[PDB]
Design a protein around this nucleic acid. Structure first.
Ligand SMILES: [Zn+2]
Ligand SMILES: [Zn+2]
Lengths: 456, 136, 86
DNA sequence: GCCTACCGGTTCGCGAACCGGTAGGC
DNA sequence: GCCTACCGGTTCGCGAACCGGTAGGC
């Protein structure tokens, strides 16, 4: 990291490191019961100690010049152990009672709608606000990159909590995790106690948070970098970073009529809270997504299907394609386990854009997803391995788009019929889900931009 | 209301009986014993030595009157009287404190070391076997 | 846990939030617990037992609201109890 | 969280005093 | 051959100063 500007000496003297280990650490300690949820930043610029209640004006700091440089090591490594409980070098770290725990810090030539697309998916302040509702620390999480090994642990602790929740484990066991999680991922509850992760969906909520938080730092990773030479334009620099060929399908286009049909037709009878309005249609072509999908163009039963996700995710969904949840992450929230999920109805998928009456625009995808020999399921069932010869899973719903009106598109079956009853009604799904357990099976075709119209 | 008000009134008798029994015993030790004595008193009785003067005699007084507190069932820490119950102060884990709480904790009898040339004066304060009484 | 707190001065060092004079040792004093602006912790606001009841605070039932009440001496408990009502 | 008055345990500093060696006086 | 007034130095006694660990404040 760099110097904490609370020192008032940030652009003056550099933060110091002895060869490898950087003399700076950011500690944290939470007790759900006491309510305490507190930071402690230590640096060796001079020795600088910061402390207080994460996400508030509660706290204070002490900048302090040293008598010499070897006295710095003495003061630092002492303060550290006093506060953390460990020595400055350790093979594996160990938390100690009421002691802290250290957190592991690390002229443009394009169309106007395409510029708006970059505008929309690379506004990181929009993504920040996005987080504020999760109560993640807003202050120093943009400049402070939380580690990968760390976040994986943050995930694990979640997945531990679901396991604990499912088999009604001890309040202690649960307490410990809630403490472990908030310590590891600083939240901002102002002056009120961190809440226990006791629910099934509270975990899901915090899982979602991590997913989203991960993609923001992924959007930064893209944005920060390249080769800053006075030649290309700023919007073009960020376009090239997306590593995809995006084009604007014209409204006059005959294929564009189909999508708008797919949109207008496949809106849910039960999702009447809003009303769609296709502002744009983009034809999207990822770097080498056709090199990896060639295998499955042999595969039968290919379907053009909707998939929605937060506008914040689309910065990374473009650069890495659609990804499956990490293995550490909890399976809560998923119906049939971790894998790419797709819907035949634009509404159902549209709800994953997470729009509101103040943020009206949203992005939704359409992917040639090679379903193949489908595994059909009525009730929710967390699957590990697919049965033999099955390349996908299908969640059978009550309403299905009319199979006797299934139009084709470039050798892809587009089910843009309006809803009729399904062949079996013993299911606990109202609408279809299409799940692939391999990132290769999906091939993104169209990216839509949708304005929502609510009634409030 | 006859038996109700009697046990009601006769308990507030026994509550005061207890309150200023310990108080007598406290400032008896303050008169006779230095803090180091009291510290080594508790240690001998396998009791966590608290930080604080007041709190040290508060646990010696409790120790003598009711008993040397046996360690906790799960976390193996030190239960401590706090206002209306005995709360465990140990550590079920590094991350989270233990939350055990009781009015009837486990305990063996309080063993004064031989070294007491005024334990015959303190214990001569008409003190018999009795358990902690609590508020209503 | 509780908002208020009462004990015999652990030292005659801390001063009184109303009048600002040193609360002498082993004296009955009362506290109101506040957030410290300086660290993530509650801190007591020590008042001379005399001064406590002029700040406008009214503890309806001391034994359930004020901490350290049971640990006090019996006759001192009654002082608080009565003075709680006036 | 960090700051500091207080506690006991030891050393320090200095003046009385204790002592032995002595050299002028009878 | 004593005595004794004078002086240099080792000792002793006792409060002042020092000091590290910490209970109590904010
Ligand atoms: Zn315990
Ligand atoms: Zn006062």
């Amino acid at each position: 990291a760099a110097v904490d500007p609370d020192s008032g000496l940030e652009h003056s003297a550099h933060v110091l490191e002895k060869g490898g280990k950087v003399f700076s650490a950011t500690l944290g300690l939470v007790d759900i019961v006491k309510g305490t949820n507190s930071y402690y930043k230590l640096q060796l610029l001079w020795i600088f100690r910061s402390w207080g209640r994460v996400g508030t004006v509660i706290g204070s700091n002490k900048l302090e010049q040293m008598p010499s440089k070897e006295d710095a090591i003495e003061h630092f490594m002492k303060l550290y152990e006093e506060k953390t409980g460990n020595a400055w070098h350790s093979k594996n770290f160990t938390k100690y009672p009421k002691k802290f725990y250290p957190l592991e810090i690390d002229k443009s030539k394009l169309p106007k709608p395409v510029q708006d697309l970059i505008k929309m998916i690379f506004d990181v302040e929009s993504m920040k606000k996005a987080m504020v509702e999760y109560e993640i620390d807003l202050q120093k999480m943009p400049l402070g990159k939380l580690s990968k090994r760390q976040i994986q642990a943050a995930y694990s602790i979640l997945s531990e909590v679901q396991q604990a929740v499912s088999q009604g484990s001890s309040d202690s066991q649960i307490l410990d995790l809630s403490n472990r999680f908030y310590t590891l991922i600083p939240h901002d509850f102002g002056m009120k106690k961190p809440p226990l992760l006791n629910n099934a969906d509270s975990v899901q909520a915090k899982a979602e948070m991590l997913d989203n938080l991960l993609d923001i730092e992924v959007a930064y990773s893209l944005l920060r970098g390249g080769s800053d030479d006075s030649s290309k334009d700023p919007i073009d620099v960020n376009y090239e970073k997306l590593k995809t060929d995006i084009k604007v399908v014209d409204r006059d286009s005959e294929e564009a009529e189909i999508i708008r049909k797919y949109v207008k037709n496949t809106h849910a009878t039960t999702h009447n809270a809003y009303d769609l309005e296709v502002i744009d249609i983009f034809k999207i072509e990822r770097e080498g997504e056709c090199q990896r999908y060639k295998p499955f163009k042999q595969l039968h039963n290919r379907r053009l299907l909707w998939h929605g996700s937060r506008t914040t995710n689309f910065a990374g969904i473009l650069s890495q394609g659609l990804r499956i949840a990490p293995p550490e992450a909890p399976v809560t929230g998923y119906m049939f386990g971790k894998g790419i999920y797709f819907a035949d109805m634009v509404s159902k998928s549209a709800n994953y854009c997470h729009t509101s009456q103040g943020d009206p625009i949203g992005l939704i995808l359409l992917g040639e997803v090679a379903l193949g020999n489908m595994y059909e399921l009525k009730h929710a069932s967390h699957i590990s391995k697919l049965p033999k010869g099955k390349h996908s899973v299908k969640g059978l719903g009550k309403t299905t788009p009319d199979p006797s009106a299934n139009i084709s598109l470039d050798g892809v079956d587009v089910p843009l019929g309006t809803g009729i009853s399904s062949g079996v009604n013993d299911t606990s799904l109202l609408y279809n889900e299409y799940i692939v357990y391999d990132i290769a099976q999906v091939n993104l075709k169209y990216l839509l931009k949708l304005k929502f119209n609510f009634k409030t | 209301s006859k038996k109700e008000k009697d046990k009601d009134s006769k308990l507030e008798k026994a509550l005061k009986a207890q309150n200023d029994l310990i108080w007598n015993i406290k400032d008896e030790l303050k008169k006779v014993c230095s803090t180091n004595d009291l510290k080594e008193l508790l240690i001998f009785n396998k009791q966590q030595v608290p930080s604080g003067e007041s709190a040290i005699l508060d646990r010696v007084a409790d120790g003598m009157v009711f008993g040397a507190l046996l360690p906790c069932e799960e976390c193996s820490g030190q239960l401590v009287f706090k206002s209306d119950a005995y709360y465990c102060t140990g550590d079920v884990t590094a991350w989270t404190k233990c939350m055990v709480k009781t009015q009837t904790p486990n305990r063996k009898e309080w063993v004064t070391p031989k070294e007491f040339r005024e334990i015959s004066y303190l214990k001569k304060l008409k003190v018999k076997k009795q358990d902690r009484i609590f508020p209503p | 846990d509780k908002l208020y707190r009462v004990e015999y001065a652990k030292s005659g060092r801390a001063s009184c939030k109303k009048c600002s004079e040193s609360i002498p040792k082993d004296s009955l004093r009362m506290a109101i617990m506040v957030q410290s602006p300086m660290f993530d912790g509650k801190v007591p606001h020590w008042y001379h037992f005399s001064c406590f009841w002029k700040v406008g605070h009214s503890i309806r039932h001391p034994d359930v609201e004020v901490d350290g009440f049971s640990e006090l001496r019996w006759d001192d408990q009654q002082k608080v109890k009565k003075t709680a009502e006036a």
